[PDB]
């Protein structure tokens, strides 16, 4: 009919959603978590240091074996690091040096990488010739790639600079399901432990829960006040944390559909580059735009520790699947392991 | 000690040597970022010297290998990926002078130049200002006054004066004078003069960077 009716319809729908949220929200997480013993101070030491990269490291991911990890730097090299011996397993010369995201397949057969070059690249590691080669080259995206994660050897999700997300079939190289609900640049993705749901954060300060099979957005969050730079699912898949450039970190629960608690501090004025949960979910590690990475109590929201071992902006942060150690990358080209 | 990991050590050493060689090779080359309002002014410059989201162009001039990156096809928020070029040697800002008569575009170009030259990431990287379409600009001068978009302008409608006025207006946007230097050049469909000016600017930028690293400049 006319825009005047659709706008007011959307407004009243949003008002009803807010009223339902307020009615369901009976108590805050602080009052209920007060009965939990605080974790106290958690001191961590750099057990390993990796100095193979010669440029700013932007993205990395841990392998399912909790020993191997892939590191993506803008020097045009993907280095598979043996965390135990710090040995370089493979060095992949990238066709485009301007990469800012990479993923390690769960089985370890393939690894993905992308960035300013909208065309992704799937590299097969276990080739019979012994040399890494691109198995597939996804080129359907129009914006810079920001985050990608493997659902399987034949399925991979990928976010881009545009306000869209896609699920690609590596066998044929076609988008199986395209998500377009977002209104801002999708910067980070995180797959749920069940491989059924995944949440995406964008620059519109909102988080949307998308299904890998259905493709319809279930829940939408708008509790942040700036661009969401990082996102990570709770180890049980029932909640997730969101890092934004306004130094605010908000933990959102799927069942509650609202931020349970916010992690912030006066001295902490810079944004958050990466966020990662521990195996128990009690510790929330977040890498900030500064040279420090802080450990936050996922329930009490207290600074359990600070990994101030870097000298440049912390770019990536990932905890091992076994929870034994956490790798923190920085723009200083170094990658350190903490535990 | 180890039995088989001892060979993995040699493999990692070879990989590290290859990484060092590749890094040295990359450092031997010079990186340039191509920006500006309008695709024509950038396309002509990309064409005048040469051997998706982002395009990488190569060209060698007087033993120097230049790497020019065009990011006009991104069409995404720059503040989320502009930091990727924090290490480029110089920025090539291409703008057509004829924009002053086409719909106001001069104001957008000036805004983009001010946003770029005053960005925290590019605080140290100089910018090469390419004022393209000098011939068309000269032609437009005799037709419409320059005050259409510059109300404060007061002078004769001659090519040289208007060109100098626009150059001054553009360079004045830099708020880091003591740190930046703008190499302005008027160009059109031309011979190697353009790549020659690019080479001359890159050489001076490299000399000044070395002097700053040594504490002289």
């Amino acid at each position, epitope marked *: 009919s006319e825009l005047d009716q659709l706008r007011q319809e959307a407004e009243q729908l949003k008002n009803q959603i807010r009223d339902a949220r307020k009615a369901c929200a009976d108590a805050t997480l602080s009052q209920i978590t007060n009965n939990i013993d605080p974790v106290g101070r958690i001191q961590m030491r750099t057990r390993r240091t990796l100095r193979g990269h010669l440029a700013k490291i932007y993205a990395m991911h841990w392998g399912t074996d909790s*020993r*191997l990890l892939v590191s993506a730097s803008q020097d045009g090299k993907l280095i598979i690091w*043996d965390s135990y*011996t710090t*040995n370089k*397993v*493979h060095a992949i010369p990238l066709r485009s040096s301007w990469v800012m995201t990479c993923a390690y397949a769960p089985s*370890g057969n393939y690894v993905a990488c992308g960035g300013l070059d909208n065309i992704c690249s799937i590299y097969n590691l*276990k080739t*019979r*010739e*012994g*040399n890494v080669r691109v198995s597939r080259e996804l080129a359907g995206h129009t914006g810079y790639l920001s985050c990608c994660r493997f659902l399987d050897d034949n399925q991979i999700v990928t976010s881009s600079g545009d306000t869209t997300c896609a699920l690609w079939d590596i066998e044929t190289g076609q988008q199986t399901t395209t998500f377009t609900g977002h209104t801002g640049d999708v910067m980070s993705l995180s797959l749920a432990p069940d491989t059924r749901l995944f949440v995406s954060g964008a620059c519109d300060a909102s988080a949307k829960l998308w299904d890998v099979r259905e493709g319809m957005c279930r829940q939408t969050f708008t509790g942040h006040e700036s661009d969401i730079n990082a996102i990570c699912f709770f180890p049980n898949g029932n909640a997730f944390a969101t890092g934004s450039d306004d130094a605010t970190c908000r933990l959102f629960d799927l069942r509650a559909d609202q931020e349970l608690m916010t992690y912030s501090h006066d001295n902490i004025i810079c944004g958050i580059t990466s966020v990662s949960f521990s195996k128990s979910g009690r510790l929330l590690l977040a890498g900030y735009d500064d040279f420090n990475c802080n450990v936050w109590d996922a329930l009490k929201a207290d600074r359990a520790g600070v990994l101030a071992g870097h000298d440049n902006r912390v770019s990536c942060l990932g905890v091992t699947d076994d929870g034994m150690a956490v790798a923190t990358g920085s723009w200083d080209s170094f990658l350190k392991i903490w535990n | 000690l*180890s*039995a*088989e*990991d001892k*060979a*993995a050590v*040699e*493999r990692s050493k*070879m990989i590290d040597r290859n990484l060092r060689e590749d890094g040295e090779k990359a450092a031997r080359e010079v990186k340039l970022l191509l920006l500006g309002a309008g695709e024509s002014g950038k396309s002509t410059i990309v064409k005048q010297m040469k051997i998706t989201g982002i395009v990488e162009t190569h060209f060698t001039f007087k033993d120097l290998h230049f790497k020019m990156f065009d990011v006009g096809a991104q069409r995404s928020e720059r503040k989320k990926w502009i930091h990727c070029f924090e290490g480029v040697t110089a920025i090539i800002f291409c703008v057509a002078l004829s924009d002053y008569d086409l719909v106001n575009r001069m104001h957008e170009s000036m805004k983009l130049f001010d946003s770029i030259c005053n960005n925290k990431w590019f605080t140290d990287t100089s910018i090469i200002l390419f004022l393209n379409k000098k011939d068309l600009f000269e032609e437009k001068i005799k037709k419409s006054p320059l005050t259409i978009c510059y109300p404060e302008y007061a002078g004769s409608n001659t090519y040289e004066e208007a060109a100098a006025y626009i150059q001054c207006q553009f360079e004045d946007l830099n708020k880091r004078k003591d740190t930046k230097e703008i190499y302005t050049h008027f160009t059109c469909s031309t011979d190697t003069k353009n790549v020659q000016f690019v080479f001359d600017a890159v050489t001076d930028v490299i000399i000044k960077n070395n002097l700053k690293d040594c504490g002289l400049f």
Partner: single-chain antibody
Amino acid sequence: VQLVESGGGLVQPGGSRKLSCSASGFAFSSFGMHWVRQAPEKGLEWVAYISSGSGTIYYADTVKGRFTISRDDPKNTLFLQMTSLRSEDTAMYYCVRSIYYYGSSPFDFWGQGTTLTVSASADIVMTQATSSVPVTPGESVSISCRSSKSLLHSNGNTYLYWFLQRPGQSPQLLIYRMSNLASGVPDRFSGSGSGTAFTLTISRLEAEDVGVYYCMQHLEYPLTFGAGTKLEL
């Protein structure tokens, strides 16, 4: 992946000959090369090894100083120069590639080899419990071997290797490190061990299983193969 050895034929005692082998279908510069010879009746024996970077060249005590191993990466060819070879050196020489990294499968490919005939301690001994064992289709066979010392390195990896040489073909890697099967090998094979006593089971034995099963340890560079277990159909 293909390896074609060359430089065989008859040679007089005390002479010299240079064995060569052209490599194709893989990154020769990335793989390390090994030389394994098989006497007309004896089992396999390690001869020489050269790393991917032409460094850390090692020779067995039986051939140290007498033979020479060299590789030409720009030419993609391997060369084994034999100087004043003895009569005991008569054996068919097989070329073997290797790549060493976490999760790698070295000795995964063996060349066809060429016949070379000369005209008329301090190593891990693999004491094979048996030389021949009768088997039938559909049944199961257990091949076992013993080593001088526990191959279980401090890192928990058991440097044990099991090869199978079918009649009329070069040996092929079945299981490496006692816990991982090579690519292209049926999953019905099962090898295990406690570090000193090892057992190799073959469930659902087929006609393709006939051959000689050679065991090898990689705890120390002086590799010493076993006597080989020949199965009768």
